Amino acid sequence: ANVVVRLLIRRPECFGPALRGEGGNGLLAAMEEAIKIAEDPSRDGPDTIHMGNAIMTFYAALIDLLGRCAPEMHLIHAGKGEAIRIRSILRSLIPLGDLVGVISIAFQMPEPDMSAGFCPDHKAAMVLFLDRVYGIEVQDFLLHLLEVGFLPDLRAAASLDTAALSX
Amino acid sequence: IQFLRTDDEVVLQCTATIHKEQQKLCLAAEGFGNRLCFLESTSNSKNVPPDLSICTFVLEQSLSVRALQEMLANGHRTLLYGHAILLRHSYSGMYLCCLSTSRSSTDKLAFDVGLQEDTTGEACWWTIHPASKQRSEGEKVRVGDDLILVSVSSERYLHLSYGNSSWHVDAAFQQTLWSVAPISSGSEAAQGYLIGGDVLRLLHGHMDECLTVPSGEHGEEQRRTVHYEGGAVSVHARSLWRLETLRVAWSGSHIRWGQPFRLRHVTTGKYLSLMEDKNLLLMDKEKADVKSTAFAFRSSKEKLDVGVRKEVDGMGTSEIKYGDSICYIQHVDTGLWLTYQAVDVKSARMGSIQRKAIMHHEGHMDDGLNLSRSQHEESRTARVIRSTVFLFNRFIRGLD
């Protein structure tokens, strides 16, 4: 994990240009534009590679890599220094409010539809990054996250009678 | 071939190629009033001289990564590659560290560089690396070697960031080459001898006066005027001068006779300039030309040697003392000498005793310029005085 973070920060081009660089802002607008591209067929192949879905999957994979690359559950991070350093590096690289906004998108719950878009598994990477890099230890932060990014998706999951196309 | 020992003064320069033109920008620090550093233009020193006083740092300790983490979890050494150094600002006395906040919005992941008082933590230490394949780790660093400074805390490079107005060095992941210019080698600096970059003043043998300007009770137009004065002016802030050498390397060496150097006033920040239609006055750095602002110290009144000493790359030789060293000011253009006048007519002679200093050919054979250096306390006090009066005049104008 340490050498992977070192190589990634030595070569900043590995991160997405919408996230890293003097251009794009971050993963919020990255994900929104990716959803726009997935919805608009003029930015794809006229079974084709959905460019928006591919961008979303790439960013989710990068976030999941960084999350699983976070030091630990604070077993050694409680008394270690380089673990705290890596955690601070990850925190400075990925902002928190951005992660909350990406979590709070409240995808639709659909006669089936196509799952080559904003997959519900994209949220799991952000959840893992939150749990490992930042964690849940503040009451109001937990409550705010539960309101903005959990209740919509919980309602959409609870509102099923028979048409269960996505487990 | 000269090695970088410890407890010696160095300057950190670099080259930036912007607008298809090269420029030599240095690392400078105001110290008092602000924390973050900035850039200084070492090049283009023909009309705008660089403020050498604030771009000087000293290496305190040179420990390895193991010893650093080891002391942190708890002598005239030699700079080695891969080690970690501690750069204390010579003027402010604080230590160079990597800040946590961000100022340049163009780099949403880079950190700023500045100064801090305490030496705790990994922020104030910087690990050193080479910038060439010919020199590996564990080798000795020599003068002119291109090095890379990496933060121990943030593990970021001391990058030279570019901006329209935010020409600010930051802590980014792209490296930048930095050149090391020595100033004082930390060797035996001869006590009582004149050293370059000093803040001192002049006195007369049997007049007990010093070269100074009017006080703040008059306007800037009169403060620009120059004269001699005695009494309580012997110990004042407006009575000190600084010998700014044109050289960027080894400027804090033993000053020898004949070499040129600007005379800066620590209270006003201006230089003693001369236009032939008038006498010498004070003018700012934005137009300080090497011709008009360059002066030298002679041992006599004749013109036996002018263009004899060209360049010496070293500490030099202890020649000019403070007490028993009768200097004579000589301009690089006109070659005139100091003369005290009687500008005050007999009608007010018993009032403000003031003898103006005119530069002329003949002069009077009783000057006897004796040097007297001011202590670090008075020098820092005068510099901070200039700083706060500048900032306060800025604030007063902005509020009015």
Question: DSSP of B60-89, one letter per residue?
Answer: EEEE-HHHHHHHHH----B-BTT-EEEEEE
H/E element, B124: none
- CB A136 within 8 Å of CB A142: yes
Q: Pull the structure tokens for residue B125.
A: 């230490």
Distance CA B57, CA B225 (A): 34
- Say which residues have a Cβ less than 8 Å from residue B143's Cβ, sequence separation at least 6: B1, B2, B4, B180, B182, B249
Going by their DSSP bridges, the two strands B271-274 and B21-28 should be labelled as unpaired
CB contact residues (below 8 A), chain A span 26-65, against chain B: 26
- CB B81 within 8 Å of CB B134: no
CA-nearest residue to B110 within chain A is A92
Distances in Å between the Cα of B364 and the Cα atoms of A119, B300, B302, B367 are 94, 12, 13, 7
Distance CA B7, CA B328 (A): 33
**DSSP per-residue codes, chain A:** -HHHHHHHHHSGGGS-TTTSSSS---HHHHHHHHHHHHH-GGGS------HHHHHHHHHHHHHHHHHHHS--SSTTTTT-SHHHHHHHHHHHHS-HHHHHHHHTT----------SSS-THHHHHHHHHIIIII-S--HHHHHHHIIIIIHHHHHHHH--SS-----
The technique by which this structure was obtained is cryo-EM
- CB B250 within 8 Å of CB B183: yes
- CB B379 within 8 Å of CB B266: yes
Residue A17 in contact with partner chain B when CB distance is under 8 A: no
Beta-bridge mates of residue A116: none
CA-nearest residue to B106 within chain A is A22
Which amino acid is it at B182?
P
- CB pair distance less than 8 Å for B155 and A93: no
Going by their DSSP bridges, the two strands B271-274 and B241-245 should be labelled as unpaired
Nearest to A93 among B73, B106, B109 (CB): B109
- CB B128 within 8 Å of CB B85: yes
Nearest to B173 among A10, A22, A85 (CB): A10
- CB B123 within 8 Å of CB B151: yes
* Residues of chain A contacting B154 with CB distance shorter than 8 Å: 89
- CB B240 within 8 Å of CB B264: no
For residue B185, the 8-state DSSP code is -
Helical packing angle, A121-129 and A51-69, nearest 10° = 30
- Say which residues have a Cβ less than 8 Å from residue B364's Cβ, sequence separation at least 6: B339, B340
- Taking the mean position of all CA atoms in its chain, how far away is CA B351? 38
CA distance A40 to chain B (A): 30
Residue with tokens 């999350």: A67
Distance CA A1, CA B293 (A): 59
- Taking the mean position of all CA atoms in its chain, how far away is CA B153? 30
Q: Pull the structure tokens for residue A53.
A: 């879905």
Q: Residue A146 phi/psi, 5° resolution? A: -60, -35
Which amino acid is it at A13?
E
Residue (of A121, A69, A57, A120) closest to A94 by Cα position: A69
CA distance B164 to chain A (A): 14
Distance CA B160, CA B364 (A): 53
* Residues of chain B contacting A93 with CB distance shorter than 8 Å: 109
Q: H helices within B54-157, ranges in order?
A: 65-73
SS3 B180: strand
Instruction: Tell me the CB-side half-sphere exposure of residue B119, using CA atoms within 13 A.
Output: 16
Residue (of B201, B230, B211, B143) closest to B359 by Cα position: B211
Instruction: Tell me the CB-side half-sphere exposure of residue B220, using CA atoms within 13 A.
Output: 10
Distance CA B142, CA B51 (A): 25
SS3 B233: helix
The structure was resolved to a resolution in Å of 3.5
- CB pair distance less than 8 Å for A81 and B69: yes
Q: Residue A62 phi/psi, 5° resolution? A: -65, -45
CB contact residues (below 8 A), chain B span 154-183, against chain A: 154-155, 173
- Say which residues have a Cβ less than 8 Å from residue B177's Cβ, sequence separation at least 6: B14, B15, B131, B146, B147, B148
* Residues of chain A contacting B155 with CB distance shorter than 8 Å: 6, 9, 85, 89
- CB B37 within 8 Å of CB B113: yes
- CB pair distance less than 8 Å for A85 and B153: yes
* Residues of chain A contacting B69 with CB distance shorter than 8 Å: 81
Going by their DSSP bridges, the two strands B271-274 and B227-230 should be labelled as unpaired
Distance CA B151, CA B381 (A): 32
CA-nearest residue to B100 within chain A is A92
Distance CA B183, CA B197 (A): 9
- CB B193 within 8 Å of CB B254: yes
Which residue out of A85, A86, A93 would a mutagenesis test of the B interface target, given it has the greatest number of B Cβ atoms within 10 Å? A85
* Residues of chain A contacting B161 with CB distance shorter than 8 Å: none
Residue B387 in contact with partner chain A when CB distance is under 8 A: no
Residue (of B183, B185, B196) closest to B319 by Cα position: B196
How many pairs of residues across A and B have Cβ atoms under 8 Å apart? 18
Residue (of A6, A117, A113, A11) closest to A55 by Cα position: A117
